[PDB]
Each structure stands twice: as C-alpha cells, then as structure tokens.
Design a protein around this ligand. Structure first.
Ligand code: PEE
Ligand code: PEE
Ligand code: PEE
Ligand code: PEE
Ligand code: PEE
Ligand code: HEM
Ligand code: HEM
Ligand code: HEM
Ligand code: HEM
Ligand code: Y52
Ligand code: Y52
Ligand code: FES
Lengths: 80, 295, 380, 147, 61, 379
C-alpha cells in the first residue's frame, strides 16, 4: 500500500476535464510564451553571471598563453 | 449525485441543484416565486393523472370545471423547447479524509426518454444490478460485480442507474466503499462495463430480462405508483406505455443487442466522475479513462 | 485473495509497484528524467557492448586489429562501435545532470539512495576507464600507463600494488586480458546496484522541486512519467545520434588511431572529456601522492554532501544565495574541464590550482556557511 | 525504427565481409590438362577438379553395385561429362584423399583405406558415405564458380 | 470526415488499431526509404558509384 | 520497528531469506542441494573470472592461452582444475536437486519449478559454450556435431546455422561469440536464481511427508544454516579429492589434441552430464526427429506438474510410484551408458528402448500408477 496511507487532507475540491475535451497545447501566445520569458527573466541573473565570468577567464587564459608564445623583439634589439 | 450533474453537464442548466443556491434561497422574492408559477405551471405542460376507483368521465368533468380558462395568445399554448445540455468528460473530486466512507459516481451520457435504446440500457443495468452488505444472497449472487464485491469486500454498497431526461441522460454507477477498497472496486466495476460491451451472454440477459419484467410490474404496486407512471408517461412519452408493450420491447432484447448498445454508449467514451470523501486510493482521470476500453 | 493478477503476481507486482501504480510527485521536472535515461543508457551500453565483444580479441597483437576488423567487416559493426563509444559519453552527460539535480534539489538527504548513487558513479568511471584500453591505441596504453603508475606513490605497499594490477612490470597483454574481463563484468554490477539504488528510493519516493511534502498531490507513474520519460529520451537521443552519425570522431583523441607503441609518448596525454575535470585536479598537486589523494577526494567528496547540509529548507529553489553559489560550482567544473585539456604550462597551471582549490572550498566551506547565513535571513 | 535497429544488430552476427570473400572460388578450365589432377582450396578444405581421359568418362559411366553405399545418381549433382568437382574430404574420419593411382583409378585415402573411383563414389573402404559435391554454378562456361 | 471515420474504422477497436500500425508501418517503410534514398542521391549528383558506373561497365570494358 | 534487522530494507530480505525464514522442521539432506547449487554458481563465476583474465578468444591462441594458464599462471593449473570439475559438481547437484522435486512433489510449486527448468536449460547452454573455449578436438567437433543439427529444420534451418556460426563452419567468428556467451550466461543464472527463490518464498519449502508443516516451523538460522554448511563440506570433499588426485578422470583425452577440422575423432562423445541426452538424440536415426527427441528429453520437465494425478503430494507413502521412480533413475543411468558407446549392436536397440521407456514412464506410467494408487487408497 502506497496509495491511501499518504496524507490526511480535508476540504479540497478539484476539477478536471478529459484530455479529449480540451486542447493539448493551449494559449501559446496568451499564457505559455509570456511565462517562458518570465522564467528566463527571473533566473538569467543567477545562472549567466558565473558562466559569463568563467568565459572571461577562458578568453584571457587562452590569449595570455598564446601571447607567451610570440617573441619579445626587445630581446634581440642589440643582438648583432 | 449533485456533484455528478454539476460536472457532467457543467456549464448548462442541468448542472444546477434542484434546491438551489444559498444566496438564491436567501434573496428570492414573492415576485420571483409568483413569476415561476405563472411562467411554468401552465395547462398544456400539466397532466391531471388519477388511479383507483375513479370513473374517467367523472374525472374529466371535475377537471373541466376547476382547470380553467383558455390561453389567449399562441405563446401561452406552445410548449417550450429547452436549450441542449453539453456533456463533459470530466471529474470533480471533493476530498475529506475525516469522512468515514468514500462515495464515487461514474457515468456516461444517456440517450433520452424517446430513445428505444433506453430499454436495452436498463436490461444491461439489470445484469450488473446492485448490492449492499445486507443482501442475504452473499457470494452466491448472480451479479458478477456483487459476487466480486462480496469475495473481496470491495464496497458497502453499489448501484447502477440510467437516469433519463428529455434530450439526454446519465448511464453509470455509484458505490460506497472504505478508503482502501476504492481502487479495486472501481477496477472491477469498469471491468464489468467492458464485459457488457464484449462478453455478454444470452444466459445473462435471459435473467436480466426476467428481473426487469418483475421490476416494471413492481413499479405499479398501488395507486400512487400507477399515477406516478401515468403522470410521467404522458409528460415524457406523450402516451401511456402498458406493461404489455414494455414486455414486448424487453422480450426482444438479446445478448448481441446488449453488446451493441453498450459499446455505443460506454466503450472508449470519456466518462463523468464524482468522488466525495477519503478518496486517495482512487486517482487520475487518465487511469479511469483507460478503463473504458478493452476488457 | 486479490482481484486482478497485476497486484498479485510476485513478478508483475514489483513491475507494477515501480513502473505502473508507483506514487510520484505531481510537479517533478525534466531534471527527474535523467534517472530513467541512465537506466536505458545502461541497458543500451550493455547490448552494444555484447555485440562488440562477440568480435573482439583480447591480445596486444590482435586488439587494435580486431576492433578495426569489426568496423570494416562486421555488418553495421562500424555503427555498433560508434553507438557504444558515444553512448559512454551519453552515460556521463546524463549522470552529471543526474548528480547536479540532486545537489540542487537536496535529494542527497535520501542518504542510502545518494550513497548507492556515488558507488554507481565510481563503478561507471572504472568501467569506462578499462573499456578505453580495449582498442589498445596510443591514448589507450598511455592513459592506462599514466593513471595506474600513480599507485606506486603509495609508501611501502605501493610499488607492489601496481605490478600486481599490471600482472607484470608494465601495461601489457596480462593487463589487457584482465581489463577486458573487468570491463565485461562491471556493467552487471552497475545493473545490480541500480536495483538497490531504486529500492532505497522507493522507501521515501521521489523528491520534488519545491522540497515540500508531495503527499498532498501524488500521481501514478503511468502514464504521466512513463510518457514524460520517453519524451525526454527521444529529446536527448536526437543530439547524440546526430553526434554519432555526423561527427563520430569529434569527442575522441585521434592519437587512438595510432596503435599502442610503448616507445613513443604522445605529446599531450589527456583523457576523454568526462575525466578532464578530475585530471585537472590530479595535476594541481605537483606531488605524486598528493595528486592521487586530490583525485580521489574530487569524487569521494560526494559522500560528504549530506553531512554538509545546514539549510532549514531542502532545495535551493527559495535560496537565491545558494543558487548562484551552485552555478559558480558548475562553472568551476567547466573551467576544470578546460584546464585538464591543456598542457601543464603558465597560465594554465595557476588557473587549475585555483579552480581546483575553489571546488573543494565551495563544497566544504561556503555551501554550509551560506546555507546557515540564509537561515538567519529567514529569521531562524 | 525498431525493425531497422533490430535488423542491423541481428546482421552483425552473420558472416562478415572477409568471411564472405572466401565463399566464392572460380576455376579456369583452361588450366587443367588430361594427365594431371588439379585441386584447389575452398572454404579451408581441398577442392578436387579432375580432368580425365576418355577411359574414365566412358568406362566409369558404367555404374555397378546394386545398392550403392550412398544415394549418388549421375542425373543429380553432376553437370559436365568431361568435368568433375569434389570436396577433397573423406566421409569416414574427414581426411584428404590423394589423387594418384590407388585402386579404382580415382582416389585413395591413406588413413583407413577407402578407395574412390573416377566418379568419386565409395568403393572398398570403411567410409559410411560417398564423397561430396558442392552447390556450384557453371553458367560461366569457360570457368566454373563454386559459390 | 476522415478523422471521424479513421477513428471508428481503425482506432476504435484495439484489434483494428494494432493492425493499422502494422499495415501502416509496412507502407511507411516502403515509402520513407525510397524517399530518403532519393533525397540523398539528388543531393550528391554524379558523386556516387551508381552515377559513374556507366564509364567502366555495361557498355564498355 | 525495534531492531535494525527487521527494518533495514537491505538487511530485511537478508533476514527474511537466510535468518528468520520459516522452514519445515523435517526437510532432509535432499533439501541441501539448493544451497549447494547457489554456492557452486558463485564458485564457478569466481573461478571462471580468474581464468578469463588469462584467456585469449582466438583459434590461433585459445588452446595455447589455456595451456599457458596451467603452466605459467600462479595456481592457474588449480583454477582451471576447479572450474572444469566444478562444472561437474554443478550438474551432480542439479540432477539430485531435480530428482528430489520429482520424488517429493515439489513441482507443484509451478512457478518455482518452471524457473527451475529454465535455470537448467541455461546451465546446459553455459557448459556447452564453455567446452568450446579451450578449442581442443572434442571442443570443435562437439560444437560441430551439435550445431550442425539445426540445419535439419525445414527451410529456415540452413540459414539458422550459418548465422550462429558467423560463417560456413565453426571457426574464429564462432569462438569469440561463444566466449562472450559463456561470460554472459552465468549472470543470467544468477538473476533467475533470485526469481527462482522469490517464487519459493511465496509458499516456503515442502517437506518429505508432503503435509502442512505450519504446525512445526523452525528458523533457517541456525538449523539449516548449519545443516547446509555440513552438506557443503560433505559434498566438497569427494570433488576436491576428484580434482586433486584424478583431475583428468572425467574428460576426453582428445581435448589435449588441438582442434583440427581435417581429422574427425573416432568417438565424439560429450561430457557425462550430456550423455543421457546424447543417447536420446541418437535413438532417432532421422536428423530432425533426433533434434526434437533431444529437446523433448529436457523440455518434458515442463509437463511434470500437469501429470500429477495422486491425491498425496510426495512418494513417501506411495510404494508403487517409488519403484517406478527408481526405474526412471536406473533408466537414466542406462542412457548415460549408451551415450558413451559407439552406434553399433547391441547398443543401438538398447538405447532406443531405454529412451522409449524414459518418455513412457514420465508421460504414461507415472500418471497411471498414481491413479491406480488412489483407488487402492479407496478414493
Ligand atoms: C564535471 C562535469 C563537467 C561538465 C559539466 C557540464 C554542465 C553544463 C551545463 C549544464 C546545463 C545547464 C542547463 C541550464 C539551466 C539554467 C537554468 O535555468 O537553471 C535555473 C533552474 C532552477 O530551477 P528552480 O529555481 O527549481 O525553478 C523554480 C521555478 N520553476 O534550473 C535548475 O533547476 C537547476 C538544475 C541544475 C542542473 C545543473 C547540472 C550541472 C551538471 C554538473 C553538476 C555537478 C555537481 C557536482 C558533481 C561533482 C562530481
Ligand atoms: C580513486 C581511484 C583512482 C584510480 C582508479 C583506477 C581504476 C582501475 C583500477 C584497475 C585495477 C585492476 C585490478 C584487477 C584485479 C581484478 C580483481 C577482481 O576480481 O575485481 C573485483 C571486481 C571489480 O571491482 P572494482 O571494479 O575494482 O570495484 C570498483 C567499485 N565497485 O568485483 C566486483 O566489483 C563485483 C563483481 C560481481 C558482480 C556480481 C553481479 C552484481 C551483483 C551486485 C549486487 C546485486 C544485488 C541485487
Ligand atoms: C514494418 C514491418 C512490420 C513491423 C511489425 C511492427 C508491429 C507493431 C505492432 C504494435 C501494435 C501496438 C498497438 C498497441 C497499442 O494499443 O498501444 C497503445 C499505446 C498508447 O495507448 P492509447 O493511445 O491510449 O490507446 C488507444 C487505443 N484505442 O501505444 C503507445 O504508447 C506507443 C508509444 C511508443 C513510443 C516508444 C518508443 C520511443 C523511442 C523509440 C526508440 C526506438 C529505438 C529502437 C528500439 C531499441 C533498440 C535497442
Ligand atoms: C538444444 C539445442 C542445442 C543448443 C546449443 C547451445 C546454444 C548455441 C547457441 C549458438 C548461437 C549463438 C548466437 C548468439 C546470440 C545470443 C542470443 C541470446 O541472447 O541468448 C539468450 C541466452 C541463451 O540463448 P542462446 O542459447 O545463446 O541462443 C542463441 C540463439 N539466439 O540466455 C537465455 O535467454 C536462456 C535461454 C535458454 C538457454 C538456451 C537454450 C538453447
Ligand atoms: C540425468 C543424468 C542422471 C545421472 C545419474 C545421477 C546420479 C544418480 C544417483 C542415484 C541415487 C543415489 C542415492 C540413492 C539413495 C536411495 C535412498 O536413500 O532412497 C530413500 C528415499 C525414500 O525415503 P523416504 O520414503 O523419504 O523415507 C522417509 C523416512 N526416512 O528416496 C529418496 O531420497 C529419493 C531422492 C531422489 C534422488 C534421486 C536422484 C536421481 C538423480 C537423477 C534425477 C534425474 C531427474 C530427471 C532429469 C532428466 C532431465
Ligand atoms: C548508473 C547510474 C544511475 C542510475 C541507473 C540511476 C537511476 C535512478 C533513477 C531511475 C531514479 C528515479 C528517477 C529520478 O529521480 O531521476 C534515481 C533517483 C535518484 N538518484 Fe540515481 N541513478 C544513477 C546514479 C546516481 C548518482 C551518481 C547519484 C548521486 C551522486 C544518484 C542519486 C540519486 C538520488 C538522490 C535520487 C533521488 C532523486 C529525487 O527523487 O529527488 N544516482 N536514480
Ligand atoms: C556502463 C557500461 C559500459 C561503459 C560505460 C562502456 C564504455 C566503453 C568505452 C569508453 C569504450 C572505449 C571505446 C572507444 O573509445 O574506442 C568501450 C569499449 C568496449 N566495450 Fe564497453 N562499456 C560498457 C559496457 C560494455 C559491456 C557490457 C561490454 C561487453 C559485454 C563491453 C564491451 C566493450 C568492447 C568489446 C569494447 C571494445 C570496442 C571499442 O573499443 O570500441 N562494454 N566501452
Ligand atoms: C542454478 C540452478 C538452481 C539453483 C541455484 C536453485 C536454488 C534453489 C534453492 C536454494 C532452493 C531452496 C532449498 C532447497 O529446496 O533445496 C530451491 C528449491 C527448489 N528448486 Fe531449485 N535451484 C536450481 C535449479 C532448479 C531446477 C533445475 C529445478 C527443477 C527442474 C528447481 C526447482 C526447485 C523446487 C521445486 C524447489 C522447491 C523444493 C521444495 O521446497 O520441496 N530448481 N532451489
Ligand atoms: C554456471 C557457470 C559456469 C559453468 C557451468 C562453466 C562451465 C565451463 C566448462 C565446462 C568449461 C570447459 C573447461 C574444460 O573442460 O577444459 C569452461 C571453461 C571456461 N570458462 Fe566457464 N563456466 C561457468 C562460468 C564461467 C564464468 C562466469 C566465466 C568468466 C567470467 C567463465 C570462463 C571460462 C573460461 C575462460 C574457460 C576456459 C578455461 C578452460 O577451458 O578450462 N566460466 N567453463
Ligand atoms: C585508460 O585511460 C583512460 C582514459 C580515459 O579518459 O578513459 C575514458 C585516460 C586517457 C588519458 C589520460 C587519462 C585517462 C584517465 S583519467 C582518469 N581515469 C579515472 C578512472 C577512475 O575510475 C574510478 C576514476 C578517476 C579517473 S581520472
Ligand atoms: C561443444 O560441445 C560440447 C559438448 C559437451 O559435452 O560440453 C560439455 C559435447 C561434446 C561432444 C558431443 C556432444 C556435446 C554436447 S551434447 C549436448 N549439449 C547440449 C547443450 C544444451 O544446451 C541447452 C542442451 C542439450 C545438450 S546435449
Ligand atoms: S579417413 Fe579416409 S578412410 Fe578413414
């Protein structure tokens, strides 16, 4: 038994329709997509900043490593 | 049963309770009441029925005297054609775990008073029948659902109904069970529904017809139940259907017909579900919906 | 008795109580899909592996050739090798998201479930490690050489511990044959522990994104999550079939096309991508013994996650401070993956030492601290 | 998707490309004279391709022995009168017969006896059956393919 | 109505449903393959062996 | 829940299977071979793993790798010794395990019994493919003779064989897949065993008397935990004696000659535990009928529960069924003997009769005598 002995619940009425009486993907532009933006809006200031900052470290780390391959012309400036 | 109507015919007039809202009872006026009476209690929509030691001619004479003057316009003659009510494959679950036992009603849309299929649906409903823990027959009852209900202690009671209305109806069943016997009860109940559409034998309906015959005759035991039949037969059929005629319709019912009629109104149809009380074991409309096909 | 034969049949019963009538929270997201993905991916790897093993020859003089013969002569053998190789990557992708989910939604509080999880990860890493040696290419041999030669850093017992595992004095035929036997065996252990993993889970049922009691709203697994998982399957299976049937050699070192040669060291001995983060942590400590410990600690640290939970709420959904700190760690692991693929030179050396330092710092110090700091902002 | 993936995987257990490559052999008939017996290799085991003078095509067409030790009827698996192809393997303990003289002119197995005539029929010896003739095609005319 | 009839004739009974799946798959395979092979061969005109085949056989050798 | 032995979801099926599990007080030593098969399976898997870590699946290296294992690997001669003879210990225990159930009506646990037959069939397939691995003469020709039978199947037969072979004869494509199969199958045996035991724990163990033992149940530990271990060391002594004094007693010496597809061994016989089935195979001269007769000889165990007609469960109080049982046991011995002998007179007719009686006893006489017994009991 896992259904029946779960929780003691009172005074809750729920209403639902058959899947065949309703749309599967309803209100794409009136309700769905406006929330898709809302969910992106709320989290992007938590998710993106460390990833953005991580890329910066990568961009510097790569460039600096490449710069250390090039030669410093001041080494030979008096070499004859 | 109020909840069943409230969700089966949700958004229509049939979804309303007979007694009405609390607010309506609170605020209904003498004008509102008098309006209802004048609007609805009109001669063509009324039937003066009688049954007993009464001369019919004497009846229509006393009726001719006290049932009064003629309507003037054509509006007051015509009988209104009610707007149709939309069925909805849906559910309503009013949960209360403190409630001792749970109630569950499941139904599909009926045909209406006019349809001759309403006879077959009553034959089919007779097969499954009904039960409550005082049925002395016990485990030996002919009804399969009743036998399974006894063998496995599935419910306190279960009943099948074919409530017909003017243009629609409600073919289904209702049972009362303990919090942990609901799912198994619903399982077996839906199984017998499929058994109707699929496996119904001539032996089964030969019994069911005999029960329905004895039922309609028992329906007319007294003057009031005869008057009730008469007052309703005219109001719904437009005429009186003698027991002789009922028998002719019923006696023509065979197993092949019960299968067809049931497959028409039950099989792969989105049912209406009303569940009240401690109702955890019974869950998900989709599971109930999948119980509507393949025995 | 019992009415139907779905609740009765002792075989169909745990089939029913796990994939049919099993109560699940109504609001678990797509982050809960990767459980069933790992399950299918395991059955996929085992099947593709069996088909490959029926054409494989465990010998240093025939290993490379047998694998090549499989791709060139066996009907769709090129594909089965393709699916099995890339499927190993699909396994790690799903398992990293599976882990990341639990860390974010406090699923580790199911300690028995969580601990069996870590063990499943460790067995998977060992499984993919020994399987990589089987084709016996350059990166196969030298990957096996570099990693196993670490055990000799252990004092006294160490240098014997290595030569025993090798079955000789270097990685050779006695090592290949036992690695193939090990690679054949381990996935069945993964299968078994999975059943234990799921058993401990069904004790409490699934957690949910909100982290609150979902007993008020449970739905049957079928059809809601039976359908949801299959959707999540084909959703995830499309990019990898695209990966495997358009850019099959994208992930792997081309060095593994050169047959193993113990007299030529590849210029840059890097692992596959899913080991890169651990490889970077290994090379953070210049000391050979410390590097081994740091490597072991990088994965064994997951055992310490449940004991480092200090927040009054289970998940991170209502914890904005722990949220960004979580994503710091995720980005931290990316930087580690990047460092591991690069040579041991400046500036990669110091970047790796800091990224690996912060990795343990976030998990050991900041996560239980920030969690506490959050509780006092909740007035507790 | 299921039908295909299954089909592909089931196919991986049947004969590989290299195995299939050694299923077919062709024999240039313009490289086998009368006086020497040329035998090749096919599927790992010897394949007899004999060229005989008229003293075998005629005299060994005279088939005797009331009830032969194995159902061999020359209207079955023998196509050409001047050609004969056999599986160079004894049916007793599976060894290879030498094609010199022997007894019945044809073949003699140096293991337990078993003298085979020109047609490759079992005569004096312990072999429980005749020899063996493969399923070949001869529509090439100038050459024979033993596919 | 195609939708209504496709339901009652094929999708309603579980037996007729399964037969549709089989029958539909047999037809789908025959169609999807020939279509896919066509789309692929056109995208590589003159590149495949079946295209350059006429130069070295079935006409001259 | 007080203690953490009844609570712990891991320790609780450890407890409810090997500690607190109610067992009949009077089950005999014939109930020991269950736990023997279990340990023997874990033994074979371990010894097999150790051997596999030195094995090379290739026709040019198979024989040599096994020889190298015996000659160079530390105690490799012993691990090969234990694994080879352990396969025989498996069949000895499984034949007594089966014989027990047939005698004490244990087959009425149909789910338990059916999973049992499947376990037997997987074991036979496991030992069959393992025999090919050393790639000796008897290995190759045993594999050749048996698999070449499938070509007797109408139409689909010739393709069915060449697919399983991966070629046109038993070769390297066959050895590599047989090794993979031999590696895989024991884990299936392990899994089905867990199912085998699960169906058993539904009703618990039967007892020699065949009556309800609920009136007298004892905990598995320590009564049968100790009894099994005793039965282990009791059975393990003769086979260690077998393996460490006469290691090459059971096997064909032909398997010391490397596989040679151009020399057929004079007498191609199987190991002893296949001999009875081999004899039944050669009873029918027709190749297709022989295959069916072979398959029927083992698949007939599925028909045992439906051929029970006696009002009592066991054979303890059934003297007629007792001697008829021992006839069948002796019948199987005669079959084992016939299978080891050449296909000549009188062995041919003896084999045809012994194999005929084998099915006759199981299909006809056992349900008949059982009925005849019931009427002598006045039923
Ligand atoms: C080492 C492995 C190295 C490789 C790691 C590759 C990781 C690549 C990035 C993983 C994919 C990121 C997906 C982008 C999702 C961004 C996002 O929107 O997150 C916010 C949103 C938060 O939702 P809620 O607040 O609960 O929602 C409430 C209202 N609905 O998403 C989440 O639920 C968070 C899910 C976290 C999964 C992160 C997976 C990271 C994988 C690595 C984790 C490793 C953990 C430590 C393991 C050590 C070994
Ligand atoms: C942090 C460490 C970093 C370095 C990692 C290096 C990994 C590679 C090391 C290679 C060493 C080679 C040694 C070869 C000797 C092999 C001897 C042997 O028999 O192996 C034991 C072998 C494998 O162990 P490992 O893979 O080492 O363990 C990993 C974690 N589980 O045994 C097993 O794990 C169990 C095998 C039996 C499985 C039986 C079926 C599964 C049953 C599970 C329970 C099911 C319940 C239901
Ligand atoms: C081509 C040559 C012939 C091929 C033979 C194919 C025979 C297939 C016959 C199957 C018939 C199935 C029909 C049974 C059925 O009813 O299923 C129902 C059931 C839905 O029920 P309802 O719609 O509620 O039912 C309404 C009934 N009025 O059907 C389904 O859910 C199907 C869902 C399947 C999707 C799952 C597969 C997704 C992933 C595919 C990956 C495939 C990879 C390859 C296989 C794996 C190989 C390693
Ligand atoms: C009694 C007839 C003689 C049987 C000879 C032994 C079997 C020889 C098999 C050679 C073909 C190998 C092909 C490899 C495909 C493996 C498929 C598989 O997963 O097997 C399930 C495997 C056993 O099947 P195989 O015997 O390997 O079947 C081979 C043909 N499919 O495990 C099982 O499911 C147990 C089934 C009972 C044992 C098999 C009875 C024959
Ligand atoms: C197939 C290959 C078979 C090859 C031969 C297998 C080995 C055959 C060994 C022969 C048996 C040796 C032991 C004989 C013991 C005789 C004996 O003690 O009988 C007594 C006792 C009767 O006593 P009760 O009435 O219970 O007494 C109650 C009060 N105490 O009888 C028994 O114990 C019956 C035990 C059954 C064991 C039978 C072993 C037979 C082994 C082969 C069985 C094959 C089954 C069919 C397989 C086909 C596939
Ligand atoms: C082969 C490896 C694995 C398999 C097959 C597997 C399988 C599963 C499955 C099917 C679920 C249920 C569905 C879900 O919650 O996603 C689950 C849940 C879970 N797994 Fe795993 N898993 C594996 C690895 C891991 C790992 C590596 C960890 C931790 C480090 C882990 C810890 C958990 C936890 C805590 C849950 C409960 C999640 C929740 O309900 O919130 N598992 N696992
Ligand atoms: C979780 C399960 C498994 C994982 C993670 C895994 C992983 C791997 C990996 C990473 C390789 C390297 C291949 C390459 O990169 O070229 C490999 C190869 C191989 N594996 Fe597995 N494997 C698994 C299961 C199995 C099983 C069950 C078997 C056999 C029964 C198997 C047999 C083989 C064989 C024969 C090879 C050599 C073919 C090749 O190198 O491509 N694998 N495996
Ligand atoms: C690897 C193979 C097998 C293993 C590991 C195994 C294991 C066991 C174990 C541990 C028991 C409980 C102890 C006992 O009753 O002896 C048992 C009982 C039983 N087994 Fe097996 N068994 C195997 C093969 C078979 C076979 C081949 C059959 C039938 C053809 C079978 C049928 C039964 C039955 C009917 C019982 C119940 C016996 C009773 O309680 O009277 N098993 N098995
Ligand atoms: C019920 C389980 C098993 C049975 C009945 C079995 C049976 C056999 C048999 C009869 C042989 C023939 C050896 C000989 O006569 O010379 C053999 C060989 C072999 N088996 Fe197993 N085996 C089992 C488990 C395993 C496992 C699990 C493995 C590997 C993981 C394995 C690996 C090998 C190897 C490598 C050989 C070749 C060594 C030799 O030929 O002696 N076996 N097995
Ligand atoms: C045989 O070597 C396998 C390598 C690999 O990436 O396998 C997929 C490899 C190749 C080149 C360089 C390094 C490696 C392995 S790095 C590594 N390998 C492992 C294996 C583990 O098993 C428990 C745990 C942690 C780690 S970290
Ligand atoms: C590869 O061949 C293996 C033989 C053998 O005895 O292996 C132990 C063998 C040797 C010589 C002659 C015959 C055999 C096999 S006889 C046999 N082998 C099997 C295998 C089965 O698996 C389900 C079932 C029934 C039988 S009967
Ligand atoms: S092998 Fe040719 S005669 Fe015996």
């Amino acid at each position: 038994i896992h259904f029946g002995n779960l929780a003691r619940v009172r005074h809750i009425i729920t209403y639902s329709l058959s899947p065949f009486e309703q749309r599967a993907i309803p209100n794409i532009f009136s309700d769905a997509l406006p929330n898709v933006w809302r969910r992106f809006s709320s989290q992007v200031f938590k998710v993106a900043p460390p990833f953005l900052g991580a890329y910066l470290l990568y961009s510097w780390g790569t460039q600096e490593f490449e710069r250390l391959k090039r030669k410093n012309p001041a080494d030979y400036e008096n070499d004859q | 049963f109020d909840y069943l109507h409230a969700t089966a015919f949700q958004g229509t007039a049939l979804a309303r309770t007979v007694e009405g809202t609390t607010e309506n009872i609170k605020h209904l006026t003498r004008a509102d009441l008098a309006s209802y009476i004048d609007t609805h209690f009109k001669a063509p929509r009324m039937v003066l029925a009688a049954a007993g030691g009464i001369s019919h001619k004497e009846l229509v004479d006393a009726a001719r005297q006290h049932f009064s003057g003629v309507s003037f316009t054509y509006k007051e003659d015509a009988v209104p054609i009610l707007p149709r009510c939309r069925f909805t494959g849906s559910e309503i679950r009013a949960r209360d775990d403190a409630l001792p036992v749970a109630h569950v009603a499941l139904a599909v849309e009926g045909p209406g008073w006019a349809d001759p299929d309403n006879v077959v649906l009553h034959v089919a409903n007779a097969i499954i029948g009904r039960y409550d823990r005082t049925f002395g027959g016990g485990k030996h009852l002919s009804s399969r659902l009743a036998a399974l209900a006894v063998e496995h202690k599935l419910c306190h009671s279960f009943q099948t109904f074919n409530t017909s209305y003017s243009d629609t109806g409600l073919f289904g069943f209702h049972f009362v069970a303990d919090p942990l016997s609901i799912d198994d009860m619903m399982f077996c109940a839906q199984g017998e529904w499929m058994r109707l559409c699929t496996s119904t034998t001539e032996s089964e309906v030969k019994r069911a017809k005999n029960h329905l015959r004895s039922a309609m005759v028992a329906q007319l035991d007294g003057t009031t139940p005869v008057c009730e039949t008469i007052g309703s037969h005219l109001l719904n059929y437009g005429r009186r259907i003698s027991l002789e005629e009922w028998d002719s319709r019923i006696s023509a019912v065979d197993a092949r017909m019960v299968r067809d009629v049931c497959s028409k109104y039950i099989y792969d149809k989105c049912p209406a579900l009303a569940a009240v009380g401690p109702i955890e074991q019974l869950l998900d409309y989709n599971r109930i919906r999948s119980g509507m096909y393949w025995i | 008795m019992a009415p139907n034969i779905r609740k009765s049949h002792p075989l169909l019963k745990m089939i029913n109580n796990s994939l049919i009538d099993l109560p699940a929270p109504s609001n678990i997201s797509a982050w809960w899909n990767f459980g069933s993905l790992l399950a299918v991916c395991l059955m996929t790897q085992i099947l593709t592996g069996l088909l490959l093993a029926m054409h494989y020859t465990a010998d240093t003089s025939l290993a490379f050739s047998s694998v090549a013969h499989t791709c060139r002569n066996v009907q769709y053998g090129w594909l089965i090798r393709n699916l099995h190789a890339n499927g190993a990557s699909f396994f790690f992708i799903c398992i990293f998201l599976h882990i990341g989910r639990g860390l974010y939604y406090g699923s580790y509080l199911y300690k028995e479930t969580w601990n069996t999880g870590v063990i499943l990860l460790l067995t998977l890493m060992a499984t993919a490690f020994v399987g990589y040696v089987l084709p016996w290419g350059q990166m196969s041999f030298w990957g096996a050489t570099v990693i196993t030669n670490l055990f000799s850093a252990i004092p006294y017992i160490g240098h014997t511990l290595v030569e025993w595992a090798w079955g000789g004095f270097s990685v050779d035929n006695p090592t290949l044959t036992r690695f193939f036997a090990l690679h054949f065996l381990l996935p069945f252990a993964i299968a078994g522990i999975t059943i234990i993993h799921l058993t401990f889970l069904h004790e409490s049922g699934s957690n949910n994104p909100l982290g609150i009691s979902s007993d008020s709203d449970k739905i049957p697994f079928h059809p809601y999550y039976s359908f949801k998982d299959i959707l999540g399957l084909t959703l995830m299976l499309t990019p990898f079939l695209t990966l495997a049937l358009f850019s099959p050699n994208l992930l792997g070192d081309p060095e593994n096309f050169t047959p193993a040669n113990p007299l030529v060291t590849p210029p840059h001995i890097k692992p596959e991508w899913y080991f890169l983060f651990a490889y970077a942590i290994l090379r953070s400590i210049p000391n050979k013994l410390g590097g081994v410990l740091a490597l072991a600690a990088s994965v064994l640290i997951l055992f310490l996650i449940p004991f480092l939970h200090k927040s009054k709420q289970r998940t991170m959904t209502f914890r904005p401070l722990s949220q960004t700190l979580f994503w710091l760690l995720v980005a931290n692991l990316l930087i580690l993956t990047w460092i591991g693929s690069q040579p041991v030179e400046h500036p990669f050396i110091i970047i790796g030492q800091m990224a690996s330092l912060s990795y343990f710092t976030i998990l050991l110090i900041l996560f239980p601290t920030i969690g506490t700091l959050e509780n006092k902002m909740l007035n507790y | 998707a299921a039908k295909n993936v299954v089909t592909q995987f089931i196919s991986s257990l049947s004969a590989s490309a290299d195995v299939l490559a050694l299923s077919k052999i062709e024999i240039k008939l313009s490289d086998i004279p009368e006086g020497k017996n040329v035998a090749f290799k096919w599927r790992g085991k010897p394949l007899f391709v004999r060229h005989r003078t008229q003293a075998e095509i005629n005299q060994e067409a005279e088939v005797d022995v009331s009830k032969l030790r194995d159902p061999q009827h020359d209207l079955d698996r023998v196509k050409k009168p001047e050609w004969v192809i056999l599986v160079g393997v004894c049916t007793h303990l599976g060894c290879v017969p030498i094609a010199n003289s022997g007894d019945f002119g044809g073949y003699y197995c140096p293991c337990h006896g078993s003298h085979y005539d020109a047609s490759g029929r079992i005569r004096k010896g312990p072999a429980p059956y005749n020899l063996e003739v493969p399923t070949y095609q001869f529509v090439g005319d100038d050459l024979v393919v033993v596919g | 109505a195609l939708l209504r009839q496709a339901y009652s004739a094929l999708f309603r009974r579980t037996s007729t449903f399964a037969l549709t799946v089989v029958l539909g798959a047999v037809l789908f395979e025959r169609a999807f393959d020939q279509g896919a092979d066509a789309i692929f061969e056109h995208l590589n005109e003159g590149k495949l062996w079946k295209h350059i085949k006429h130069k070295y056989e079935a006409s001259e050798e």
